[PDB]
């Protein structure tokens, strides 16, 4: 009484709605520090003439 | 913040001669360094 387990369980089924179906969410967070930046995007190259 | 390490291996008190030290590894550590010590194999 007046004491309930704070973590509740998702119940996902293949017969649920669009707002109740499980969604895999990944949050990409970017930080810039005084440390040297090293996470670069792909670098496009052109053929040599 | 860059850690540069140069090295040179030469087969032979310090010998009297000239030998430049080529760069070996650039380590992007970005920390502070003030003291050091070596390690020996016993």
UniProtKB/Swiss-Prot annotation, chain B:
Organism: Severe acute respiratory syndrome coronavirus 2 (2019-nCoV)
Subunit organization: Binds to host ACE2. RBD also interacts with the N-linked glycan on 'Asn-90' of ACE2. Cleavage of S generates a polybasic C-terminal sequence on S1 that binds to host Neuropilin-1 (NRP1) and Neuropilin-2 (NRP2) receptors. Interacts with host integrin alpha-5/beta-1 (ITGA5:ITGB1) and with ACE2 in complex with integrin alpha-5/beta-1 (ITGA5:ITGB1). May interact via cytoplasmic c-terminus with M protein. May interact (via N-terminus) with host bilirubin and biliverdin, thereby preventing antibody binding to the SARS-CoV-2 spike NTD via an allosteric mechanism.
Stated role: Attaches the virion to the cell membrane by interacting with host receptor, initiating the infection. The major receptor is host ACE2. When S2/S2' has been cleaved, binding to the receptor triggers direct fusion at the cell membrane. When S2/S2' has not been cleaved, binding to the receptor results in internalization of the virus by endocytosis using host TFRC and GRM2 and leading to fusion of the virion membrane with the host endosomal membrane. Alternatively, may use NRP1/NRP2 and integrin as entry receptors.
Superkingdom of the source species: Viruses
Protein name per UniProt: Spike protein S1
Residues of this chain annotated as glycosylated in UniProt: 32
Gene (UniProt): S
